[PDB]
């Protein structure tokens, strides 16, 4: 039920470290379910399908001077450090995984970009 999304939102996440960090693409599969486990595990009971901006605040990931801790914990756990994100993935990005709608937006002025629309 929230697979789809949430496998959009984590693809986006490693593709950056694929383009960015020529991580291989043999560990970002590893990354890519360890961070889908994680994300479903902590969207579980913050899902409303009907109100899809419901929860979106606490589903929400972003990136700064400070590392959203779930993308810390499961890179750190596949062999990425924090120093290492820090440098591969843009510095101010905000995604936001949402019943039917996975968006980001790179930069605090950046332009908001749809990934997933059903």
């Known amino acids: 039920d ?6 959009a939102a984590v693809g986006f996440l490693s593709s950056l470290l ?31 399908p009907e109100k899809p901006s419901k929860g979106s605040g606490y589903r929400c990931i972003r990136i700064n001077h400070k590392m959203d801790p779930i993308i810390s ?12 994100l820090h440098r591969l993935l843009p ?17 605090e002025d950046g332009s908001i970009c749809v990934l997933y629309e059903e």
Do not use: N
């Open 2 to 7: 929230m697979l789809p999304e949430i496998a």
């Open 91 to 107: 510095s101010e990005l905000t995604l936001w995984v949402d019943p039917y709608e996975v968006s980001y937006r790179i930069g």
């Open 73 to 84: 914990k499961v890179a750190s756990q596949i062999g990425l450090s924090q120093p290492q």
């Open 18 to 48: 694929r383009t960015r960090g020529c991580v291989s693409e043999q560990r970002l599969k590893v990354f890519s379910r360890a961070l889908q486990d994680a994300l479903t595990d902590h969207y579980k009971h913050h899902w409303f």
